[PDB]
């Protein structure tokens, strides 16, 4: 086509989606990770994760307001990944890398799994 | 912080949100523009437009499944702007610029209004 493109548009959309999440506006699901609860938008979770994409395209699960993750999933690792989904920034540290990689593998977030693998390989 | 950033993340999220819109997945509102209807996600509309941000933060309107726009709004201009919201690409042409600018002013999409003004000024 002959379209023009606004370079910062995608980043501005994601920033506003994160502002709606912080103010709990139009969040339609609570993700339960052991004792911890995280509110989010189903559409953003699906856009970022192969696991959520599969869950919310399922004809019964698409209607659930609560999703319980596997008990092996670490709440801090989930929190770091949820923050990444809404910001593009990943808080990857020596103390959390193993939990972040395991959660990214479970959530099917291939770009996160890739950088965790590279950061681990460099430390070996 | 000491975060790492994935450059293409925001663009990849927006691409997936557009794929969900095309397949009518988790769309929660229909925007009526005279005889035409457009399905979308309330969160994306709010993230892109000052008008939708005001509508869907209103305690009564946030629950509506149908929103009727002002009868002066051109359906093609709306369609072009809805496509821009979900892709960052604006199909701006001599034949549609006036309708696109008027719709962007109504929707409160300041970056679109700005480029329409500049494209018009250059043609004068």
């Amino acid at each position: 086509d002959s379209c023009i493109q606004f370079t910062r548009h995608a980043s501005d959309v994601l920033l506003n989606l994160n502002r709606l999440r912080s103010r709990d506006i139009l969040t339609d699901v609570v993700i339960v990770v052991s004792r911890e609860q995280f509110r989010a938008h189903k559409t953003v979770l699906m856009a970022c994760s192969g696991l959520f994409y599969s869950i919310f395209t399922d004809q019964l699960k698409c209607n659930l307001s609560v999703i319980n993750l596997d008990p092996e999933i670490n709440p801090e690792g989930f929190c770091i990944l949820l923050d990444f989904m809404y910001t593009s920034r990943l808080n990857l540290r020596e103390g959390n890398i193993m939990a972040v990689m395991a959660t990214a593998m479970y959530l099917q977030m291939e770009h996160v799994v890739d950088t965790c693998r590279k950061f681990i390989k460099a430390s070996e | 912080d000491s975060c790492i950033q994935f450059t293409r993340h925001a663009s990849d999220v927006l691409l997936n949100l557009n794929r969900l819109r095309s397949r009518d997945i988790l769309t929660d509102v229909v925007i009526v523009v005279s005889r035409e209807q457009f399905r979308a996600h309330k969160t994306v509309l709010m993230a892109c437009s000052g008008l939708f941000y005001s509508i869907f933060t209103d305690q009564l309107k946030c629950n509506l499944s149908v929103i009727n726009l002002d009868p002066e709004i051109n359906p093609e201009g709306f369609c072009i702007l809805l496509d821009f919201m979900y892709t960052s690409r604006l199909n701006l042409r001599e034949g549609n610029i006036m309708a696109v600018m008027a719709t962007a002013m109504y929707l409160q999409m300041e970056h679109v209004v700005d480029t329409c003004r500049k494209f018009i000024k250059a043609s004068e």
Binding site: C3, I4, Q5, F6, T7 | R89, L90, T115
Partner: peptide
């Protein structure tokens, strides 16, 4: 704005 750019030409994509």
């Amino acid at each position: 704005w750019v030409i994509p």
